Design a binder for this molecule. Structure first.
Ligand SMILES: [Mg+2]
Ligand SMILES: [Mg+2]
Lengths: 143, 151, 145, 43, 126, 130, 46, 143, 126
């Protein structure tokens, strides 16, 4: 059936391209609709998301800022790598359950990436200050 | 599988207005528990009950309320059977219509017979919600009209 | 925690939030399925992006109800310079889309139609006009750039 | 004749609504639906 | 009761206005009033007055023409003016626009009644 | 039988509402609000008012021929946040059609074969009888 | 129209009818619908 | 049979769309029904659920607040991930059996998410204060 | 309201100009104006003035021909000149070029008004 799937994968490929372009179109439409005094966007967006429009670069396409709607094997592989990596981080006591849930409820690879990095940095700092506190406790005991 | 749950589309998206509404709800609940609790006897019980709601969000409380409503009424009315009948009617006619209304003060959902609905003023619209005028002509029993229009 | 973020990350988060919410709200996949059927039948798949009621909306365009002019042998529809969309809308839809601009005379026209279906012919013209703009060359005051 | 709907709320009286319902009783055609006879034959 | 309520479809939906009827005047009622609530603990109301958001519209009082022209009141008594302001909201308690319009009209009539009361007490004390 | 003909009408009436431009008292932020036609615009404060006609869902039920019940705006106004004119009734449904056409249901495409089957099996029954 | 089960006799010959009867009109048998249905169904589950 | 299921997946897809829209309509109908002096909702709803209606804006669609009825692979995947996450939390003595029961009888993904977060926070705080208690006990013994 | 807004497609888009209309003159308004905001806390404005980026363009003042020829103003007042400079931006408040042009024109008119006020102040103190 795979070799028969090849016969219509051209239809599916052009369909995927059309869907990608339509979603970029809808994204720009939503970007313009943001600056029209609609209170709906205050509920589905965060504070920084609602504050992006205040900068003087929001009138142009997201493709010009390095952002593209993409459904390719690269993004799925990156999602799978990030999720498996977070699972590996949960074990070894390196990633919190709350932040795991945040990753599961993110929808953005960048957001979960930053969450993992923040948790790493926080836990490493806590470990380091733990060693320092123990060492100075021993030192002052000896003193 | 039939698991239709209300989900927050962006669970990690919080704004100032959501926080303000959460604060309003928490203040209202605090006043109520202050009123009902009789001089420290169960006031701490109410604080214990509502302390776990400080970690909630406005969107979480709304999603919760929607989920309990939908779950209770799905388990009550056996909505999947209604959907199965509508699916068979869709196979027969290509038209699947449902009406949702308030009867007796409770919300109810019913399957509209395609032969007993007149849909007027649509714009080649596939959806029934875009119609500007609908007529439902059916022969009800006297008990049903009294159960619906006693008031 | 936003100090560790970057501008590109914040923009990506906002865009993903918008597309996520509206994809779940509109069932955009069903619209794409219908468009795929239209494409298999016609070799043509078209979608319109617009704001209706202040919210972004996405629709599938009937291939028989869109007239594309002044294209350059381009398989893409975005390259067109003039598009006319002729379709029949219900009065409810036109009032839902143009309440903020319809005059009382126009609403009376909607009322006073004989209504012998009772739909309204909504013809929408899209055309690329031209504007005179100025390319001004200025020196940065601090540095001679 | 369906009564005028471009009125103030005050002038939408009982007789106006009764006229709407009487028009509805006086009564089908649609652009994306089959005739009732077709559906009845299918059933 | 049909006063400020829309009891339809097996429910009891209200626009917020409380038609306080059937009790009688303060002098004719042995308990001097209907005693809606306890807050001044004796919160008494008579048959003619109506209440919206814990504030009372007096039926005994009248609107001077000066206060009729500005704030654009309709009824001869303040209670009747509110019974005229809330008519659109009675058939549609769940409409957001109706609730906002009721909120604004109720504030206007409340301010008009406060102006009438301060004018009356100032004249009486004079 | 002993039933009553219950005819229920749903229709979108048109309602006059006002869009009022009012300024925030604290900050110089002009704001927008929607009010019914009976709302008096607050002059002496910069409140600019413009009137629009907007859809509104109405209902009404006739039982038999003499009873008239629940003639009023629908108490369930399926309202939207930003669009006062986006409303509908409780009826939700769809057509399983193709490209703005009438639905070519599964039964429709199978029916000619069923009719041919009935004809052929009638021939078979007559042959069996004879 | 073909996908919706309508055959136009002027699309496959010169018509030398308008009556919905087989002795002069031609049946349509929708054998193409399944082929497109397979592809649209696969599109949904991708 | 899979390639035969493809032939009717279009019918099933439109059916699921109709079901989603019908459930959204019923949700709005129930929202309006709440503000009708019915004591049934006092039993099937909690306190906070019954005070949501007191806040303004309840008259509008839930889709304008970021809430949508959804039956997709994303939500089922999220539910499965949350359930296995809770099961892993039970082991390692991090999540209490009572809250496990609450998750198994939750019906809302955010509710179970906040329950997991609450128990993680409680256990971590208890561990931290126990460690501090042991350290100060040792310190005072030495003193 | 049509004053410096393009309310179309169910939205409210603005070019940044605020047509502060419908209030009245400072003397004719009982509150001395519209009182748009609080910051001097009494930020009062009349019917003819327009505001861009918290800068008030005054309608009572006229345009000297000397300041007409340089900076190329069109209206007889400063408010009218701002209402003429922002005509393009009303129908296209989202265009980047329109925003840049509006910002430049508003800066020019602001400098012109500052020069005119400085000249009038110097002449009056003279
Ligand atoms: Mg949110
Ligand atoms: Mg319960």
């Amino acid at each position: 059936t795979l070799q028969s799937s090849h016969i219509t994968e051209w239809l599916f490929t052009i369909h995927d391209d059309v869907k990608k372009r339509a979603l970029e179109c809808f994204l720009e439409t939503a970007k313009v609709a943001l600056k029209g005094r609609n209170k709906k966007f205050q509920y589905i967006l965060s504070d920084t998301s609602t504050r992006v429009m205040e900068i003087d670069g929001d009138e142009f396409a997201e493709a010009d800022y390095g952002l593209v709607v993409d459904n390719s094997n690269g993004t799925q592989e990156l999602q799978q790598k990030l999720d498996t990596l977070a699972q590996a981080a949960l074990q070894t006591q390196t990633l919190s359950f709350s932040t795991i849930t945040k990753l599961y409820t993110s929808s953005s690879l960048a957001e979960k990436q930053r969450l993992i990095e923040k948790d790493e940095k926080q836990i490493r700092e806590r470990q380091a200050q733990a060693q320092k506190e123990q060492l100075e406790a021993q030192q002052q005991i000896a003193a | 599988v039939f698991d239709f749950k209300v989900v927050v589309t962006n669970p990690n998206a919080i704004s100032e207005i959501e926080d303000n509404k959460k604060n309003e709800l928490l203040q209202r609940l605090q006043e109520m528990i202050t009123d009902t609790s009789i001089s420290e006897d169960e006031y701490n019980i109410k604080l214990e009950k509502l302390n776990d709601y400080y970690t909630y969000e406005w969107q979480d409380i709304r999603e919760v309320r929607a989920n309990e409503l939908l779950n209770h009424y799905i388990k009550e009315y056996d909505i999947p059977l209604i959907f199965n009948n509508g699916f068979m009617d869709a196979m027969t006619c290509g038209e699947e219509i449902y009406q949702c209304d308030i009867v007796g003060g409770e919300p109810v959902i019913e399957r509209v017979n395609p032969l007993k609905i007149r849909i007027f003023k649509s714009g080649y619209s596939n959806k029934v919600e875009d119609a500007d005028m609908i007529i439902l002509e059916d022969y009800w029993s006297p008990g049903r009209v009294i159960d619906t229009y006693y008031d | 925690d936003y100090y560790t973020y970057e501008w590109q990350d914040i923009r990506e988060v906002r865009a993903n939030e918008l597309l996520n919410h509206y994809i779940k709200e509109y069932d955009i996949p069903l619209i794409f399925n219908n468009g795929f059927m239209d494409a298999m039948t016609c070799g043509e798949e078209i979608y319109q992006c617009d704001i209706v009621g202040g919210e972004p909306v996405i629709e599938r365009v009937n291939p028989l109800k869109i007239r594309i002019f002044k294209s350059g042998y381009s398989n893409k529809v975005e390259d067109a310079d003039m598009i006319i969309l002729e379709d029949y809308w219900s009065p409810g839809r036109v009032i839902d889309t143009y309440y903020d601009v319809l005059s009382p005379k126009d609403i009376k026209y909607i009322e006073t139609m004989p209504d012998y279906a009772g739909n309204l012919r909504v013809l929408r013209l899209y055309w690329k006009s031209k504007r005179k703009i100025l390319k001004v060359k200025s020196y940065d005051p601090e540095t001679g750039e | 004749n369906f009564p005028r709907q471009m009125l103030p709320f005050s002038k939408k009286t009982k007789q106006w609504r009764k006229d709407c319902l009487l028009w509805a009783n006086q009564k089908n055609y649609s652009l994306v639906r089959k005739s009732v006879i077709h559906k009845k034959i299918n059933y | 009761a049909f006063g400020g309520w829309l009891n339809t479809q097996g429910g009891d939906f209200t626009n917020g206005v409380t038609f306080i009827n059937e009790g009688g005047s303060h002098e004719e009622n042995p308990y001097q009033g209907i005693q809606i609530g306890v807050d001044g603990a004796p919160n008494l109301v008579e048959q003619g007055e109506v209440v919206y958001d814990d504030y009372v519209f007096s039926d005994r009082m009248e609107i001077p023409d000066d206060i009729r022209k500005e704030y654009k009141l309709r009824g001869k008594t303040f209670a009747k003016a509110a019974k005229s302001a809330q008519r659109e909201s009675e058939e549609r308690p769940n409409d957001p626009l109706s609730t906002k319009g009721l909120q604004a009209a109720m504030e206007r009539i409340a301010t008009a009644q406060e102006e009438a009361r301060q004018r009356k007490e100032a004249h009486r004390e004079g | 039988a002993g039933n009553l003909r219950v005819l229920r009408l749903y229709w979108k009436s048109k309602r006059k509402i006002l869009k009022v431009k009012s300024y925030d008292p604290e900050t110089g932020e002009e704001e927008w609000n929607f009010y019914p036609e009976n709302y008096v615009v607050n002059k002496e404060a910069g409140e600019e008012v413009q009137s629009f006609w907007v859809n509104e869902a109405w209902e009404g039920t006739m039982i038999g021929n003499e009873i008239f019940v629940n003639m009023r705006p629908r108490l369930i106004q399926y309202n939207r946040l930003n669009n006062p004119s986006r409303c509908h009734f409780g009826i939700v449904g769809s057509i399983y059609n193709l490209n703005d056409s009438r639905p070519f249901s599964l039964v429709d495409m199978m029916k000619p074969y069923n009719y041919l089957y009935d004809a052929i099996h009638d021939r078979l029954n007559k042959a069996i009888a004879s | 129209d073909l996908l919706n089960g309508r055959l136009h006799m002027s699309d496959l010959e010169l018509v030398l009818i308008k009556a919905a009867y087989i002795p002069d009109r031609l049946q349509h048998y929708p054998i193409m619908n399944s082929k497109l249905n397979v592809l649209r169904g696969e599109e949904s589950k991708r």
